[PDB]
Amino acid sequence: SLSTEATAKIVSEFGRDANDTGSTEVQVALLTAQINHLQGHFAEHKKDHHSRRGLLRMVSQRRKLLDYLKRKDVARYTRLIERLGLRR
Template structure:
């Protein structure tokens, strides 16, 4: 979270920092090994940076609907990546969201299971 805020401040001070520099800084902070450029952690960090930039842009330009739809697509992609990471390795997931300052989102499977849990209990009771 601190790194993302520093990058946003740095970009606003320099007016427009090239995206390659920002990506390389994010990759160096979130990579898992020496040659890592595409792990889930790196992808989510880059998406989080872009999401913060777009949300700041939309605060000023409220009627920019094209950017708004792009923002929603990025949020959806980040959500899918985070759900995948949570299913594969929960420890890495919680480390990543704490580093990025993102809230923990309950997965759709957990919501679905909570909805059908009472019906499963009633079926089990009827069988007994």
């Protein structure tokens, strides 16, 4: 689950202060950040089915809570995906 140090960086700008660790902005950011790095892990290995199963949770959850906010505070999303990368 990446480094205990890491994510320290990403709570800023996304969050209003450090240890504001629960804004939906950050977890999404935490998830993507892992996922992205973590796609390297499945390049090599790749027949590591089990590890993948955990991945999709990250992806499922990410997407599930990326949909939550779509209902609350409009364009509190259109100010973060492009800020990050993903709307495919």
